[PDB]
Design a binder for this molecule. Sequence first.
Ligand SMILES: Nc1ncnc2c1ncn2[C@@H]1O[C@H](COP(=O)(O)OP(=O)(O)O)[C@@H](O)[C@H]1O
Lengths: 371, 742
Amino acid sequence: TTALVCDNGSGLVKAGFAGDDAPRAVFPSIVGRPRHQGVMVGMGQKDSYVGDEAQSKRGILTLKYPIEHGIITNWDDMEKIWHHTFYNELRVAPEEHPTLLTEAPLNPKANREKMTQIMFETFNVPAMYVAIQAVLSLYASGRTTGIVLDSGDGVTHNVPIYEGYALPHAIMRLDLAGRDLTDYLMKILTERGYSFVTTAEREIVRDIKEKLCYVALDFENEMATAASSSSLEKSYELPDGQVITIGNERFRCPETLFQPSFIGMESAGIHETTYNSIMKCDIDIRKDLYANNVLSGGTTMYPGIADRMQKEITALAPSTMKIKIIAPPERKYSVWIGGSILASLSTFQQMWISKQEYDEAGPSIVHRKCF
Amino acid sequence: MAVFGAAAPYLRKSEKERLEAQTRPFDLKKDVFVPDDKQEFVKAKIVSREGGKVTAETEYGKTVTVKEDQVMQQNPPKFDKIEDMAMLTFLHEPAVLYNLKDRYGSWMIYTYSGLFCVTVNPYKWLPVYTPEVVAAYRGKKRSEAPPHIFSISDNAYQYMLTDRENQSILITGESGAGKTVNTKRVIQYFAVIALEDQIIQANPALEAFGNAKTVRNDNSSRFGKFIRIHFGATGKLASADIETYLLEKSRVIFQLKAERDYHIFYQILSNKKPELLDMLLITNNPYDYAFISQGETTVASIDDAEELMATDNAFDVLGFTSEEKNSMYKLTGAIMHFGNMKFKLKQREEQAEPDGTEEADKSAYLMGLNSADLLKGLCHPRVKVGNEYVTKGQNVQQVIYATGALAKAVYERMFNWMVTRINATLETKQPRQYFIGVLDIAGFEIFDFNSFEQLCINFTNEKLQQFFNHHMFVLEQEEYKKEGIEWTFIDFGMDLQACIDLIEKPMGIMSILEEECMFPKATDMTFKAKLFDNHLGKSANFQKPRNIKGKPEAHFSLIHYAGIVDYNIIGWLQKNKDPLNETVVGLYQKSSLKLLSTLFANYGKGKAKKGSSFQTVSALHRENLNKLMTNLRSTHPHFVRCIIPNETKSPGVMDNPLVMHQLRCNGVLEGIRICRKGFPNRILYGDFRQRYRILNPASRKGAEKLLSSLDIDHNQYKFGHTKVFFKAGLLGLLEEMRDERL
Ligand SMILES: Nc1ncnc2c1ncn2[C@@H]1O[C@H](COP(=O)(O)OP(=O)(O)O)[C@@H](O)[C@H]1O
């Protein structure tokens, strides 16, 4: 038997089989419902589109994300997402496959409890397990120490690990991510004349962000460069023509990661929460952590983010340390890759939570040594 | 006794000479088998049993004392020279050694040993291979005719014809101990009873592409050759098929301190074909090429230049063109050019980039790809994530493992396709019914620096020996259900399967090795620690190593049927990795050569697609062994055991250590040991009477009266309805009471 590695994320579902080199199914975690009335009789419209289909019918739907910041807020939508993943994308029967699921640090406990209750009762999986995203990133990176910065789409977090032991008191979690960057980019494009308001235009703005945004190495110098030159402006082609041209908005959007006061948050940038997690860690492992700073997740994928973060952390740390930032090209899928590695490990086969254990001890079994 | 032509003496000595040799004094008390120093057990006499002191007077004039706990009787003279080792009155280890010793001194080659057929090769010509005995055997039975492989060949044939099933001949011996010519005479006999020339003609190709120098042999076979001889409905010769199994890939890359790579690279390195070297850019110096130079560079094995010529001749006389041999040679040269590639880490990153490009250019010009394109495909693989491709990163270790796996893959691919071409040449359109296959496999090799490859070999031989053991179990159950005497319903296989479960099963050695080469920062010490933490004491066969006579090193020891083997860990993680590079495989599919056929296509709804990185030599090997067992377990098997008498080509004189080594590593001793738990001495009632009636001179009542008046216990003999079963002690006691009766 083989296991299923479903990294449900928050804004992208990634599923596949344990032992693969990459996820087989990657689609947005979206549930769309029609908002107009529907006149053609006989074509038999359905009531909810889930996944990559909702992006095709995007023009006549209201797109909902069932998961807000790591946390699941709509359990019916999430059951639809999982059903679509199991049956219409992987085409497997979950009654005969263990399932490894992934979660961010410092979430509510009812999240995991309801997740496993659903997986055992609605889908009847034989076993299941919930892993932390950062640990799986560090598996897939081929390290055993290092401070991992996993910037997804709802949540950003640092998890310092040394020699296979994690330092829980030094785990930092920040609720600024790609979704807030998209909202800031909408709000900041509005000052050039373009307005995107609907949930179906949020997707167009997310595409603009992915395709044109980058991190400036020096924010003030890039601002002056954009104010004087015009060599920074790119054009983008909306899905109906009418090209839009954006200038300093390209590097002004992901700069919110380093100055979260742009969106009215009080906290510190990612370069500073990384350093603060390191300084919470014990003094004997800080050199290794400085040398093994691992990036993963979709929001770490801007051009120039590694160079920017190295410049910042280097200016912060003592001048006699080797700051080094590991940013693989397959960053976005690191959590899934590590999950596949972990579920294929042979030592792991007695760490699943079986159906018998669940029927014995209730959903509370999730927080036990079978974590 | 004239039916055996001129070979009659060598095939079987006359009854008259048997009786004239029977008359010989032998003391059953003080001529017992005795441990030795120069050998294991030597013929000697004891003066007396003085407490813990005895004195063995051997032939050499020595008078050593041995302990009363290591002495055991010698075979009686009235049962020496026995054709069937299973019928020996006393089944000991050196007993059978001396049996075969006197049989080869008396120049009797073949000897029955139960379900086996043992054959020590004679070094000079005998009339035993003349066609007269071949034709004249037709009509004689196995149970009566003296041992020979023609017997078991005919028995397999008639078994096929009566049961309408396939049979399997398992010839077991070392390359260079006569296996080739043994199989040759097998195929001759099969043709006689109704394409051998073609087999021998295409053989040098396999001898090249699947043989390499080990320490125990300079022409050792690595792949599991296996020839299927089909037939028709009328049991007449139809066609022949051949399959290759378990070809070791690690040799193409890593070679030990004392051994070489495959023969082909050296044969090409023979300058007698300068056109090959100047068309492949191969410099004469063998130290130049890193894949090969780590092994033994050159040895006095054979005339490698002449062997190159013999292979080229066999090629030109085989169905395939000259361009195809040219492509074969150039492909092997490309495999050779892979080893010298050089990679460095980048400026301020963890990415691999090539510094040397010349060997890259020339290997691409050979392979039929672009050099920049192949370098890009090695440094930056592209993988499929849903409906998009993203580039994967690699460092130097990863790209080197990928290069090694690519080379091993292309070599093994070319090999399998060459075997397909050979079989196509051999192929005849005659309808092919049930076949009788003959199998050539590596041996249970033991050394002082056993490694991963030797572990794989021993695992294979474990599966084979357990298979034979279960086969003999069912055969003994057949004998019992015939005789109407059915007892001891335990099988004989699980006692060996318990050792298999320590290699294949999850948390076994292979699974731990796979997990360890998957884990991030694993090392050999961590591998050893996990092996110990997970097996030590909690298992039955896994146990500590042993350091004897200052051996090199050993990290743990398993026990097999062939003895305790100490294995070494160093290098297993690095050598087990087999990450195949999918982008470069696609490049090969898009080549401008024959390569696109070898790599034709290689790497939802339920998919067992293990990734390219989650690939391990051990896992591929376990799969191949599984399918080989599935091919064999459908055929009724037969077993042939070949022993070298001495390392020197001088006949007559032998080497007892080499004999013991062959016996243990072969499993004849394990067969006799499985016998030793039941009643191995099995004789009918009539001859029993004619030989033991004078003890109580006068069929169940008289036999029972004699047995009760011979002080025999119940559990010591089993009363049958055609034969009454006795053990070693019973035979000894009946012998003694006969002797005092006379
Ligand atoms: N090339 C890119 N540049 C910038 N942002 C990107 C890029 N690719 C994806 N993203 C952002 O990453 C987010 C998705 O991150 P992901 O790794 O899928 O987290 P999750 O799996 O939890 O949704 C999206 O909101 C998208 O805006």
